[PDB]
């Protein structure tokens, strides 16, 4: 309701599918998280975060955690040099 | 085109490096800060030493007979008589 | 179709108003004398004297 | 590992000095390791002192 | 007013064809010349009399050692017109500016000083010191062109109509811009929250005042207002803000036992019972500390402050206090008792404010804002800079007892006077940059971008550039609209359609056309007697009705008495008379503003006079006396000004504006039919016209300026506004005429694209050419020997046999594509020249070579001033522009066999899409195109000044009556035939004659392209630059789009395969891209396998894999290994 | 510590003129390298130019000037079926369109055919259809880096990058007398276009993959509408609406 | 003088070819009571509108009620108010442009990796299952304007 | 600068009427009559003289005369 | 004063008064060409002062000689057998009045 | 034959030959031009 009306006092209004998407990601662990940094922190790939604000912080995250990235996120399989799951690239011959 | 990349990539693994690995894997230790000499020989026991990789093409690496136009270099280390903080994990170091 | 039989122009006559409308428009504009008095008296609520 | 008791020196073809026309413009990081080496020799001298 | 008594009534062309065109007249034009009265008038008054009263305030200074009271001071200092250092035999030891431009040098002056060497009291010496140089505003009373007629000008080859006002630093012409600062010597109220937090118990309220002296340095006051009940003073000296209660000031000022102070600071609000209590409270809380009498409080203040003020530890504790007192408080008055009464009136206003009887005067209007001239800035910078020279000579003398040499007492003056403290550098700096490296903000709040280079690309550029107030560069990042919205009062003193839209929008205004800053000071001698020999009662006399009702009468910083209820308007009217008749020492520059008492919160009551310089003012006519009159910014708010004659009502109104055209500036007065157009178009054009490219100037041999765009065949325009002549602009006409037919004949024309007949582009439509004049000196690089430029003896590769003259330079008239030598120098004792080929890809001809000389004497020449010429013709993609912002572009060329042809066989040469004018409100183009036709038909030139054609007899109707009685269709249309069918077209077409300015490249519209070639060395990436065929850049937003589309193959193809593809090799054991290298096996007796890669890390093993790795990845791992981090690639 | 920092970080070191950027800057520059390079580089085989509002090109096609249509190429091994086209391309080359400024010799060596003369161009033309003259390349011939043709398609983008129609693909066609780029007017809403001086980037794929994904995945034909709400994006232009009426 | 279908302005304002229907009212009939940001154009200290009218008149002219048009000329005074309005308008435009641009750049730091897998349940990069059916299901409004 | 040879719009020869123009000037015609008597009918050739302004009789004064 | 590029282009518009039917299209290139594909004119007007001028300095015509370079200062030159080909008074620009 | 130059303010030839000052050996003023050698040069007129 709130996102709708804040766009609606101007006249714009996005289709009620984007809204009911962005809800069931910014709040799916019960609690209500933000996404400027907090929610997006939950990203499997710390390299998309490296692309977000400051490479060093999320490199530090990757080094202290030591996860083997499953190589599905766009950041990872794009930087490694393969073809990625994005758009064209879920499949091959 | 007709030619394609060959090597296969599954997944990367992150990890921490100890000092003993780079200490035993060293091939040469720099002792002279001079980098280049006016004659053409870069330096003896310097940062541009020949064992670290060829340079001044007519020269040759100390450990490898491989030449300049074929080179990518090698790695050693320098002994630090003092112990300084790592500026990457220094924030978590201060927190701890 | 334009460059062969019919052409398009921002003529100056498409914009000029008929002279019968200027006998009516100049009639009303003269009526703006007593526009304030009533609005201000209704603003203050003092009789319109 | 939280400290730095090791400083790996980079390769040569990865390092090499750039050139502009006929002048040999310095690389910078070469000067950084040169300064670090000067400093560690100074530290050796002061330890001997 | 008499200056505008001769405006033309409708332009004419009688003057393009007379026997007298060409022979220089004797009296150069009047108006155009006075268009820069202010600049040179101020600088004039600066050096001949300004540092008169501005050297008689530097304090006697030198105190070094041995109980000595040497106090050496300046008796006089002057500057002399710029002559030459003694040449071998210079025929005339004078330098004219045209010389200074060629040789890329400055136009200087000579500085002299008279120091009296008072040996502990006047004993010995008056030594003259050659301080240094200073630049000179051309055509002031200090440049050799002072008072010359036109022929004596052209013989000196300086352009005939000079106006001057600029400086010349190495060829550039810098101009000081007029800034804005608050009113001179006025108690302006103010409110602000930010004040709240400086200390304890500060309210928001307060008053302010800007005080400036004759020796023009400034000081800034402030009196806050405490809630407790007391009033403070918050000023700053030498960059540190200071604190002082009111009691100390009102005791230390005048002995004058206090009950005076109370009974006077209480004027007639006797009823109050908190005011007087706060008063008594101040008077007590100043009494019980350490002081009873005047000298006592002085003692105390000095003892407190002489630690910070840094006076000599010689002086007593009261002398320093007194020194401080009259250096930072109410400077402009030069007395004490008036300093007292000023403080009094300030606080009375502050109280009657805080209690809420008056209305908070806006500190942001034009009623309280005036202007700084370049003379002020110059003089005050100089006077500050003298002090530094004195103190520097002090350390120069202290180096004597420092080096323990002979610390001499006299007869060492000459030697101790050469320290190296000259004034050249600090002045060249202020202009070279615009920066204000200094120690005092001089009232200003900023220090950079003070003088910015006036261009010469046109004449409209100049003619504006000299008429442009701006409000300080600091007010740009602000978002509040209140600093842009035209307050309804600025009518007549600023231009409403001339702001330079863009980043510095709204602020960088330009003045009107009928305002003149005031720069003639008067002798303020006998005016107070004149006031008092009428109703005005003396200042502290017995005023016959002296209580709550009576008006103060300030006088530009001087209390003079009080006036009562009956008189104030009578006095103001009498002074009206005695200004307009100009009778008795009453300058016309004077303002007489009386603010009546509203009984309601409103402006502070009063009656104020001024004579000070630096104020805006514009003439009007009076309906009481025929003569014309001058009106100051402050006193418009209480006048009735009738614009048209039809309005004038008997008994209520008083003035009559001279001509309606006043409101606008001059540039915005060169637009035709400009009240019909819509406003944002007016503004767009006033910005555009300055950008164009017309006839810049006559003498193309004087100036070695870098870029001179010229238009071969300009033409006077047919439809003209009156003020095009009154400034005789025709000597510099700007654009060339053209025929427009407005039809959608091709589709091509929309979103401002337009088609131009290709024939009438061959016949000569506005062909162009640009002169770029590079400059070279071989003294730039310091080398051995007598290197000067010449073709060496050595046989040059004989392509340089013909392409070169022998002296090393090209012949006049040759052409250069590139790979062709600019020049060749033979360095002495070397034998080999080191040539320089033509770098820039463009090609050009060589106009004339100018070789300058050593600054004064002989000097082995390097001094090359080659000046190329390039042709530029309007290609597809360049710009055009009408005179109403309707900016177009060059779409495509279209052979003349195709275009329509009218009934009478003529052939449009520029086609114009009609879709514009709904949603342009461009009616100027319509009315003035019909005008162009009517003119070229009948034979005469038609006027185009705004505000002439009423709604009664409109423009269109009268102006088509012409075509009617001429023979064409009333609505300015006419039939037309196609050019591919041959068939008539049903719907008629509208044709006219529309003036057309070319434009310059707003940006260099050149292109960029690359497929393969030389890339970067360390990164192996395609470089940019456009001059070695650069490539494309993919920033943050493009890469985000690439993340966003959902494609990996595109990245793998462009970033991976194309940008930095490099076949790399890694070892399978250790997984390090660093180590492995390619092997060179010897085919000798030592048998070894074929070429297979090996490494040093794993020297015992030999196994390698091939991986495609970018070279930027290699530089990345390079810097990682340099910064002590190693990569591990899983293999 | 300051020495190892000035190696690592110029900011964590004492202030000094002309700082040498370490890994904290070459990985956290004012934008940060990964934000700078690792998803977008400085590439070749592309261009940039200013654009003009013109009609005679398609709402699905942009007309390129001769410079980019002449310099830019595309590789192809000369098969018995593509003979005439790549032959005439290796004939004309980089001076006249359609051409082939360079052909990739069978070993893979790039043969820059720009400054060579006419006889060598005929020589390489009759060398094009040379079969495998060696053992390691029987599946290959000289792949001709020959020029773009009318069957081709290009890609464009705008700073900053807004949406999905921010990169729309348009067919290729040559036009000699052009210094400025051209586009459909009503398609202005596909790029938030201004046409008053902003720039435009041109791109060509080296392989059929990028070409075809521009032909169909990026076209205006089957991306005709706005999928945000399902209404058209490339309608017809106003100047061609008064005609209609 | 020409009604539809004649008038070539009424064929680009009543036919989706350009502008609106008040840009052709401005021209022939009026201009409108001006408004500088909600508030009618400001006053000055003594109470004058612009230095031409007595303080506190009652003609609506002291407001913004321009009467002339763009085919007969606006009188001198009303020329000023008009410029005031133009300036205010262009300022607000530019500033809000840069603001909404920075908002775009903030929001660009966002969710990236949400690939709808072949199970037709909108998943994410890391084997996570954020939902089951897009929005409602499938329909990204490609033609849902048409279903 | 100096008078151009052939008219812009159509192509007539106009690079000669200038001298006779000043001539019929001294005989005091109102320019409409002068451009008539000089035989110019379509206006796109008349605005080539009714509005030309000469810049060599005002630019030669800086001659490096001898 | 007139820069030379602009003089060169200002020439082109000048009309030759000769027969177009008695020539051939210039064979491709060959700046020389033949007789058949060319005329060849010449211009030379070195200017000086007025030998014996009065005090007046009113008009340059009394003060000068060769200061308004017209076209009658152009003169035809023959190439090869042009003489045998054409008579006098033909080869000439069309007005002898074009400044 | 040899190099020629002209003084600016008085227009009297100066012919810089040797290694020497750059002043007009009569005309005190000092800034120089060059002079035109009769040459041949091709110039199209399209």
Taking an 8 Å cut-off on Cβ atoms, the answer to whether D37 and B18 are in contact is no
**Shortest CA gap I17–chain J (Å):** 19
In a mutational test of the I interface, the residue from E22, E759, E871 whose CB has the highest number of chain I CBs within 10 Å is E871
Gapped junctions in chain A, after residues (C–N > 2.5 Å)? none
- Tell which residue, E506, E594, E593, E518, has the closest CA to residue E550: E594
Q: Is the peptide bond before F98 cis (omega within 30 degrees of 0)?
A: yes
- Tell which residue, B50, B16, E1113, E1119, has the closest CA to residue D33: E1119
Domain I1-99 part of CATH 2.170.120.12 = yes
Token pair for E802: 């013909």
Q: Say how far apart CA I24 and CA I35 lie, in whole Å.
A: 10
Taking an 8 Å cut-off on Cβ atoms, the answer to whether D7 and F4 are in contact is yes
Handedness of CA E154, E156, E158, E162 (dihedral sign): negative
- E515 among the known binding-site residues? no
Q: Cite the beta strand spans of chain G per DSSP E.
A: 32-33, 65-66
Domain count, chain J: 1
Q: Is the peptide bond before E916 cis (omega within 30 degrees of 0)?
A: no
Token pair for E214: 């004759």
Q: Does C have 3 or more CB contacts under 8 Å with E?
A: yes
- Tell which residue, F60, F70, F68, F109, has the closest CA to residue F93: F70
* Alpha helix positions (H), E58-112: 97-102
Token pair for E613: 């310089």
| Domain encompassing residue J44 | 3-46
Q: Say how far apart CA G36 and CA G45 lie, in whole Å.
A: 18
Which residues in F lie closer than 8 A to residue D28 (C-beta atoms)? 20
What Å distances lie between residue E628 and E10, E585, G143, CA to CA? 24, 18, 75
Token pair for E53: 């009263």
- Cβ proximity of F164 and E990 under 8 Å: no
Query: Rounded to the nearest 10 degrees, how much is the dihedral formed by the CA atoms of E718, E724, E729, E732?
Result: -30
Which residues in F lie closer than 8 A to residue G15 (C-beta atoms)? 241-242, 245
Using a 10 angstrom Cβ sphere, with 0-12 exposed, 13-18 middle and 19 or more buried, the burial of residue C24 is exposed
Q: Are strands F46-53 and F181-183 parallel, antiparallel or unpaired?
A: parallel
- Provide the chain B residues 6-45 that lie in CB contact (below 8 A) with chain A: 9-16
Alpha carbon E91 to its chain's center: 39
- Tell which residue, E901, E903, E926, E978, has the closest CA to residue E742: E926
- I11 and chain J in contact, CB less than 8 A: yes
Which residues in E lie closer than 8 A to residue D16 (C-beta atoms)? 1018
Taking an 8 Å cut-off on Cβ atoms, the answer to whether E13 and H57 are in contact is no
Q: Which helix (H) or strand (E) holds B19?
A: helix B19-24
Q: Domains (ranges, CATH) in chain H? A: 1-66 (1.10.10.60)
Helix (H, G, I), strand (E, B) or coil at E647: helix
Taking an 8 Å cut-off on Cβ atoms, the answer to whether F241 and G105 are in contact is no
Chain J's closest residue to I10, CA to CA, is: J45
Query: Rounded to the nearest 10 degrees, how much is the dihedral formed by the CA atoms of E907, E911, E917, E919?
Result: 170
Specify the long-range contacts of residues E198-206, CB closer than 8 Å, at least 24 apart: E198/E234, E199/E243, E201/E226, E201/E227, E201/E228, E202/E226, E203/E227, E203/E354, E205/E350, E205/E353, E205/E354, E206/E350
- Domain CATH code at residue J36: 2.20.28.30
* DSSP secondary structure letter of residue E989: E
What Å distances lie between residue F48 and E256, E561, E1033, F155, F199, CA to CA? 82, 76, 9, 11, 7
Neighbouring residues of E783: CB distance < 8 A, sequence distance ≥ 6: E827
* Alpha helix positions (H), chain G: 10-13, 25-28, 78-107
What Å distances lie between residue F114 and E161, F118, F126, CA to CA? 56, 11, 17
Q: Resolution limit in angstroms?
A: 4.1
- Provide the chain F residues 37-76 that lie in CB contact (below 8 A) with chain A: 38-39
Taking an 8 Å cut-off on Cβ atoms, the answer to whether B6 and E1072 are in contact is no
Handedness of CA E162, E167, E171, E173 (dihedral sign): negative
- Tell which residue, C15, E914, C2, has the closest CA to residue G6: C15
- F23 and chain B in contact, CB less than 8 A: no
> Which residues are D13's β-sheet partners?
none
Chain B's closest residue to E1075, CA to CA, is: B74
Q: Say how far apart CA H37 and CA F117 lie, in whole Å.
A: 63
In a mutational test of the I interface, the residue from J41, J44, J45 whose CB has the highest number of chain I CBs within 10 Å is J45
Taking an 8 Å cut-off on Cβ atoms, the answer to whether G8 and C10 are in contact is yes
Q: Does C have 3 or more CB contacts under 8 Å with G?
A: yes
φ, ψ (nearest 5 deg) of residue F102: -155, 150
Q: Say how far apart CA I57 and CA I63 lie, in whole Å.
A: 6
Neighbouring residues of C48: CB distance < 8 A, sequence distance ≥ 6: C37, C38, C41, C42
What Å distances lie between residue F119 and E172, F94, F146, CA to CA? 57, 16, 19
Q: Say how far apart CA E109 and CA E106 lie, in whole Å.
A: 10
- Chains meeting C at 3+ CB pairs closer than 8 A? E, F, G
- Tell which residue, B62, F37, D1, has the closest CA to residue E1099: B62
Alpha carbon E720 to its chain's center: 30
Q: Which helix (H) or strand (E) holds E130?
A: strand E126-130
Domain boundaries in chain I?
A: 1-99
Neighbouring residues of E466: CB distance < 8 A, sequence distance ≥ 6: E35, E36, E39, E163, E165, E175, E454
Count of A–E CB contacts within 8 Å? 32
Chain A's closest residue to G144, CA to CA, is: A15
Q: Say how far apart CA E368 and CA E181 lie, in whole Å.
A: 9
Compute how many other C-beta atoms are within 10 angstroms of the C-beta atom of residue B82: 12
- Cβ proximity of E491 and G76 under 8 Å: no
- Tell which residue, E666, E644, E803, has the closest CA to residue E721: E666
The string of DSSP codes covering F189-220 is GGTT---SS-EEEEE--SSHHHHHIIIIIS-S
- Cβ proximity of H44 and E739 under 8 Å: yes
Compute how many other C-beta atoms are within 10 angstroms of the C-beta atom of residue G121: 14
Q: What determination technique applies here?
A: cryo-EM
Handedness of CA E715, E717, E721, E725 (dihedral sign): positive
Q: HSE-up of E879 (CA within 13 Å, CB side)?
A: 24
Chain B's closest residue to E1097, CA to CA, is: B25
Token pair for B34: 């001079």
- Tell which residue, E760, E496, E249, has the closest CA to residue G81: E496
Token pair for F81: 């079926």
Q: Say how far apart CA E70 and CA E48 lie, in whole Å.
A: 29
- F243 and chain C in contact, CB less than 8 A: yes
- Tell which residue, E943, E890, E520, has the closest CA to residue E722: E943
Strands of E628-632's sheet, edge to edge? E628-632, E617-622, E655-656
- E1028 and chain F in contact, CB less than 8 A: no
- D42 and chain B in contact, CB less than 8 A: no
Handedness of CA E792, E794, E797, E800 (dihedral sign): positive
- Tell which residue, E549, E623, E640, E355, has the closest CA to residue G46: E640
Q: Which helix (H) or strand (E) holds F73?
A: strand F73-74
- E734 and chain H in contact, CB less than 8 A: no
> Which residues are B32's β-sheet partners?
B46
Helix (H, G, I), strand (E, B) or coil at A64: helix
Among F34, F217, F228, the residue with its CB nearest the CB of A55 is F34
Handedness of CA J8, J10, J11, J15 (dihedral sign): negative
Helix (H, G, I), strand (E, B) or coil at E181: strand
Alpha carbon E565 to its chain's center: 47
In a mutational test of the G interface, the residue from F194, F242, F243, F244 whose CB has the highest number of chain G CBs within 10 Å is F242
Handedness of CA F145, F146, F152, F157 (dihedral sign): positive
Specify the long-range contacts of residues E148-152, CB closer than 8 Å, at least 24 apart: E149/E26, E149/E28, E150/E24, E150/E25, E150/E26, E150/E28, E151/E24
What Å distances lie between residue E420 and E63, E397, E487, E693, CA to CA? 20, 13, 52, 47
> Which residues are E900's β-sheet partners?
none
- Cβ proximity of E560 and E614 under 8 Å: no
> Which residues are E583's β-sheet partners?
none
- Tell which residue, E476, E475, E451, has the closest CA to residue E465: E451
Taking an 8 Å cut-off on Cβ atoms, the answer to whether F238 and G142 are in contact is no
Which residues in B lie closer than 8 A to residue E1126 (C-beta atoms)? 17, 22, 75
Query: Rounded to the nearest 10 degrees, how much is the dihedral formed by the CA atoms of E789, E794, E797, E800?
Result: 40
- J39 and chain I in contact, CB less than 8 A: no
The string of DSSP codes covering E818-848 is SSSEEE--B-TTT--B--EE--SSS-EEE--
What Å distances lie between residue E508 and E179, E472, E473, E511, H58, CA to CA? 10, 9, 9, 10, 36
- G9 and chain C in contact, CB less than 8 A: yes
> Which residues are E457's β-sheet partners?
none
Strands of F102-104's sheet, edge to edge? F73-74, F143-147, F102-104, F110-112
Helix (H, G, I), strand (E, B) or coil at I87: coil
Q: Say how far apart CA F3 and CA F23 lie, in whole Å.
A: 14
- E600 and chain G in contact, CB less than 8 A: no
Handedness of CA E1048, E1053, E1058, E1061 (dihedral sign): positive
Compute how many other C-beta atoms are within 10 angstroms of the C-beta atom of residue E923: 23
What Å distances lie between residue F167 and F15, F55, F220, CA to CA? 44, 20, 10
Neighbouring residues of E313: CB distance < 8 A, sequence distance ≥ 6: none
């Amino acid at each position: 309701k709130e996102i709708k009306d804040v766009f609606a006092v101007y006249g714009i209004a996005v289709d009620p599918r984007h809204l009911s998407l962005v809800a069931d990601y910014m709040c799916f662990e019960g609690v209500y998280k933000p996404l400027n940094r907090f929610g997006i922190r939950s990203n499997s790939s710390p390299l998309q975060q490296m692309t977000f604000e400051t490479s060093f912080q999320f490199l530090k995250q990757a080094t202290m955690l030591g996860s083997h990235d499953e190589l599905r996120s766009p950041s990872a399989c794009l930087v490694v040099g393969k073809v990625v799951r994005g758009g064209t690239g879920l499949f091959e011959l | 085109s007709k030619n394609m990349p060959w090597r296969r990539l599954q997944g990367i693994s992150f990890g921490m490096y100890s000092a003993e690995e780079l200490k035993k894997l060293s091939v040469k230790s720099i002792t002279n800060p001079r980098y280049l000499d006016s004659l053409g020989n870069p330096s003896a026991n310097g940062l541009y030493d020949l064992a670290l990789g060829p340079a001044d093409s007519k020269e040759v690496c100390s450990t490898c007979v491989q030449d300049f136009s074929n080179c990518s270099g090698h790695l050693g280390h320098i002994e630090l008589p003092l112990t300084v903080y790592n500026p990457l994990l220094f924030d978590k170091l201060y927190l701890l | 179709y334009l460059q062969l039989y019919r052409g398009f122009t921002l003529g100056v006559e498409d914009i000029l108003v008929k002279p019968k409308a200027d006998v009516k428009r100049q009639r009303i504009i003269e009526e703006s004398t007593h526009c304030g008095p009533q609005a201000v008296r209704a603003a203050l609520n003092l009789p319109e004297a | 590992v939280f400290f730095l008791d090791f400083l790996v020196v980079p390769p040569s073809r990865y390092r090499p000095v750039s050139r502009l026309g006929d002048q040999m413009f310095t690389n910078g990081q070469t000067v950084n390791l040169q300064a670090v080496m000067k400093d560690v020799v100074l530290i050796r001298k002061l330890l001997a002192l | 007013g008499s200056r505008w008594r001769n405006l033309p009534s409708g332009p004419s062309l009688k003057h393009l064809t007379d026997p007298s065109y060409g022979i220089p007249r004797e009296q150069q034009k009047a108006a155009l010349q006075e268009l820069t009265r202010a600049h040179v008038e101020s600088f004039n008054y600066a050096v001949h009399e300004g540092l008169g009263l501005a050297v008689q305030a530097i304090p006697p200074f030198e105190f070094a050692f041995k109980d000595e009271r040497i106090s050496f001071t300046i008796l006089d200092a002057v500057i002399s017109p710029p002559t030459v250092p003694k040449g071998t035999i210079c025929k005339e030891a004078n330098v004219y500016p045209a010389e200074c431009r060629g040789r890329r040098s400055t136009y200087r002056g000579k500085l002299t000083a008279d120091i009296n060497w008072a040996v502990n009291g006047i004993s010995k010496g008056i030594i003259k010191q050659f301080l240094g140089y200073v630049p000179i505003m051309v055509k002031s009373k200090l440049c050799n062109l002072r008072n010359l007629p036109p022929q004596a000008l052209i013989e000196h080859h300086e352009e005939a109509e000079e106006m001057g006002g600029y400086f010349i630093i190495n060829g550039i012409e810098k101009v000081i811009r007029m800034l804005i600062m608050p009113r001179r010597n006025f108690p302006i109220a103010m409110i602000r929250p930010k004040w709240k937090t400086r200390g304890p118990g500060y309210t928001q309220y307060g008053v302010s005042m800007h005080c400036v002296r004759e020796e023009h340095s400034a000081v800034n006051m402030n009196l806050h207002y405490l809630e407790n009940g007391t009033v403070m003073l918050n000023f700053i000296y030498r960059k540190e803000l200071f604190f002082l209660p009111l009691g100390f000031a009102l005791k230390a000022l005048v002995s004058f036992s206090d009950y005076q102070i109370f009974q006077e600071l209480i004027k007639g609000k006797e009823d109050d019972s908190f005011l007087r209590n706060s008063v008594s409270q101040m008077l007590r809380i100043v009494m019980e500390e350490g002081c009873s009498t005047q000298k006592q409080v002085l003692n105390y203040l000095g003892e407190c402050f002489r630690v910070k003020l840094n006076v000599p530890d010689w002086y007593p504790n009261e002398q320093a206090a007194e020194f401080l007192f009259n250096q930072c408080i109410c400077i402009h008055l030069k007395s004490n008792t008036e300093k007292f009464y000023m403080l009094c009136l300030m606080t009375r206003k502050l109280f009657a404010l805080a209690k809420g009887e008056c209305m908070e005067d806006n500190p942001d209007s034009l009623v309280n804002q005036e202007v700084l001239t370049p003379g002020q800035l110059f003089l005050m910078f100089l006077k500050e800079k003298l002090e530094g020279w004195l103190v520097s000579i002090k350390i120069a003398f202290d180096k004597k007892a420092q080096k323990t040499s002979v610390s001499m007492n006299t007869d060492n003056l000459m030697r101790i006077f050469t320290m190296g403290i000259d004034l050249t550098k600090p002045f060249e700096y202020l202009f070279a940059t615009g920066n204000l490296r200094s120690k005092t903000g001089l009232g200003l709040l900023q220090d950079s971008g003070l003088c910015v280079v006036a261009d010469k690309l046109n004449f409209i550029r100049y003619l504006s550039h000299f008429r442009c107030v701006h409000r300080g560069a600091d007010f740009a990042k602000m978002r509040t609209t209140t600093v842009r919205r035209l307050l309804p009062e600025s009518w007549g003193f600023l231009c409403p359609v001339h702001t330079p839209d863009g980043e510095p929008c709204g602020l960088m205004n330009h003045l009107t056309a009928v305002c003149e800053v005031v720069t003639q000071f008067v002798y303020t001698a006998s005016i107070p007697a004149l006031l008092c020999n009428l109703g005005v009662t003396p200042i502290d006399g017995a005023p016959h009705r002296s209580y709550s009702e009576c008006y103060p009468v300030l006088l530009d910083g001087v209390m003079v008495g009080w006036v009562d209820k009956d008189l104030a308007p009578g006095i103001a009217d009498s002074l009206r008379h005695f200004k307009v008749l100009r009778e008795k020492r009453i300058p016309p520059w004077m303002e007489v503003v009386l603010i009546p008492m509203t009984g309601k919160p409103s402006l502070y009551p009063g009656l104020f006079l001024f004579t000070t310089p630096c104020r805006l003012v514009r003439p009007v006519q009076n309906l009481a006396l025929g003569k014309e009159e001058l009106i100051g910014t402050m006193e418009q708010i209480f006048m009735n000004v009738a614009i048209f004659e039809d309005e004038v009502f008997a008994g209520v109104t008083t003035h009559q504006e001279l001509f309606p055209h006043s409101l606008l500036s001059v540039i915005a007065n060169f637009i035709p039919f400009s009240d019909h157009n819509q406003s944002p178009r007016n503004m767009y054009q006033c910005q555009m016209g300055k950008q164009t490219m017309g006839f810049p100037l006559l003498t193309y041999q004087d100036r070695s300026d870098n870029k001179l765009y010229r238009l071969q065949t300009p033409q006077s325009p047919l439809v003209r506004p009156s003020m095009y002549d009154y400034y005789d602009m025709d000597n510099y006409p700007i654009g060339t005429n053209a025929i427009v037919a407005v039809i959608s004949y091709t589709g091509y024309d929309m979103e401002d694209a337009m088609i131009v007949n290709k024939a009438s582009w061959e016949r000569g439509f506005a062909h162009g050419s640009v002169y770029k004049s590079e400059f070279i000196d071989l003294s730039e690089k310091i080398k051995q020997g007598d290197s000067s430029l010449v073709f060496g003896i050595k046989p040059g590769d004989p392509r340089v046999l013909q392409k070169l003259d022998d002296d090393g330079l090209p012949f006049i008239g040759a052409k250069l594509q590139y790979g062709d030598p600019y020049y060749s120098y033979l360095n002495l004792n070397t034998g080999e020249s080191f040539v320089m080929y033509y770098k820039s890809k463009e090609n050009c001809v060589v106009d004339n070579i100018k070789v300058c000389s050593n600054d004064t004497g002989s000097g082995k020449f390097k001094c090359v001033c080659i000046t190329m010429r390039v042709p530029r013709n309007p290609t597809i993609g360049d710009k055009f522009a009408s005179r109403h912002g309707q900016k177009g572009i060059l779409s495509r060329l279209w052979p003349a066999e195709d275009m329509p042809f009218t009934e009478s066989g003529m052939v449009p040469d520029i086609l114009f899409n009609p879709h514009g004018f709904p949603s342009r409100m461009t009616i100027g183009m319509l009315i003035e195109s019909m005008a162009g036709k009517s003119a070229a038909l009948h034979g005469l030139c038609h006027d185009a000044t705004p505000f002439i054609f009423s709604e009664e007899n409109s423009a269109l109707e009268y102006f088509g009556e012409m075509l009617k009685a001429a023979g064409y269709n009333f609505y300015g249309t006419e039939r037309l035939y196609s050019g591919i069918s041959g068939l008539e077209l049903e719907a008629d077409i509208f044709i006219g004659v529309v003036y057309y300015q070319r434009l310059r490249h707003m940006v260099s519209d050149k292109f960029q392209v690359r497929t393969t070639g030389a890339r970067d060395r360390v990164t192996n990436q395609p470089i940019g630059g456009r001059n070695v065929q650069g490539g494309i850049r993919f920033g943050e937003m493009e890469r985000d789009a690439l993340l966003a589309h959902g494609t990996s193959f595109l990245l793998h193809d462009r970033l991976f395969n194309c940008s930095d593809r490099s076949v790399a090799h890694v070892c399978v054991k250790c997984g390090s891209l660093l180590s492995p290298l390619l092997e060179k096996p010897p085919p000798s007796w030592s048998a070894m396998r074929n070429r297979k890669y090996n490494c040093t890390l794993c020297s015992r093993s030999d196994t390698i894999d091939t991986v495609s790795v970018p070279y930027v990845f290699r530089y990345f791992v390079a810097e990682l290994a340099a910064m002590n981090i190693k990569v591990k690639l899983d293999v | 510590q300051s020495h190892v920092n000035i190696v690592f970080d110029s900011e964590m070191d004492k202030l000094m003129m002309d700082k040498y950027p370490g890994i904290r800057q070459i990985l956290e520059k004012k934008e940060g390298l990964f934000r700078k390079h690792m998803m977008g580089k400085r590439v070749d085989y592309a261009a940039r130019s200013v654009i003009c509002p013109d009609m005679y090109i398609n709402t699905n096609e942009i007309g390129i000037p001769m410079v980019f249509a002449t310099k830019l190429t595309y590789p192809q091994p000369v098969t018995p079926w593509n003979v005439q086209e790549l032959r005439q391309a290796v004939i004309n080359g980089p001076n006249v369109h359609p051409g082939a400024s360079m052909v990739i010799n069978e070993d893979g060596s790039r043969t820059a055919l720009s400054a060579v003369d006419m006889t060598q161009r005929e020589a390489v033309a009759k060398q094009l259809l040379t079969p495998a003259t060696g053992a390691p390349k029987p599946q290959g011939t000289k792949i001709v880096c020959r020029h773009v043709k009318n069957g081709d398609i290009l890609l464009l983008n705008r700073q900053p990058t807004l949406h999905r129609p921010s990169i729309q693909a348009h067919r290729a066609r040559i036009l000699p007398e052009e210094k400025v780029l051209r586009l459909h007017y009503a398609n202005c809403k596909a790029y938030n276009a201004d046409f008053d001086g902003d720039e435009m980037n041109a791109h060509f794929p080296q392989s059929e993959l990028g070409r075809a994904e521009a032909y169909v995945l990026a076209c205006t034909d089957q991306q005709y509408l706005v999928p945000k709400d399902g209404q058209p994006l490339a309608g017809l232009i106003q100047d061609h609406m008064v005609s209609g009426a | 003088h020409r009604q539809f279908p004649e008038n070539s302005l009424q064929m680009m304002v009543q036919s989706g070819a350009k502008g609106s229907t008040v840009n052709t009212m401005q021209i022939s009939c009026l201009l409108g009571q001006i408004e500088l940001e909600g508030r009618r154009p400001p006053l000055m200290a003594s109470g004058k509108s612009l230095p031409c009218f007595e303080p506190y008149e009652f003609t609506p002219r002291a407001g913004g009620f321009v009467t002339g048009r763009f085919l007969t000329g606006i009188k001198p005074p009303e020329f000023f108010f008009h410029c005031m309005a133009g300036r205010e308008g262009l300022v607000d435009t530019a500033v809000k442009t840069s603001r909404s641009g920075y908002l775009q750049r903030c929001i660009i730091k966002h969710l990236e990796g949400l690939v709808v897998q072949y199970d037709l349940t909108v998943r994410d990069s890391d084997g996570s299952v954020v939902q089951f059916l897009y929005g409602e299901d499938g329909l990204d409004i490609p033609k849902t304007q048409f279903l | 600068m100096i008078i151009p040879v052939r008219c812009f719009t159509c192509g007539k020869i106009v690079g000669n009427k200038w001298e006779a123009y000043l001539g019929l000037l001294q005989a005091e015609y109102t320019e409409g009559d002068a451009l008539d008597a000089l035989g110019l009918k379509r206006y796109c050739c008349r605005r080539m003289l009714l509005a030309h302004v000469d810049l060599i009789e005002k630019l030669l004064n800086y001659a490096p005369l001898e | 004063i007139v820069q030379d590029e602009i003089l060169a282009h200002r020439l082109g518009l000048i009309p030759i008064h000769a027969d177009p039917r008695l020539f051939e299209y210039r064979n491709q290139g060959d700046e020389e060409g033949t007789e058949i594909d060319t005329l060849q004119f010449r211009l030379q007007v070195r200017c000086t002062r007025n030998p014996h001028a009065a005090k007046d300095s009113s008009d340059p015509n009394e003060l000068y000689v060769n200061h308004k370079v017209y076209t009658r200062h152009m003169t035809w030159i023959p190439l090869g057998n042009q003489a045998d080909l054409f008579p006098e008074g033909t080869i000439r620009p069309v007005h002898d009045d074009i400044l | 034959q040899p190099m020629i130059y002209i003084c600016g303010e008085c227009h009297t030839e100066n012919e810089i030959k040797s290694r020497d000052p750059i002043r007009c050996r009569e005309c005190g003023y000092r800034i120089m031009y060059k002079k035109r050698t009769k040459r041949l040069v091709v110039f199209d007129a399209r």
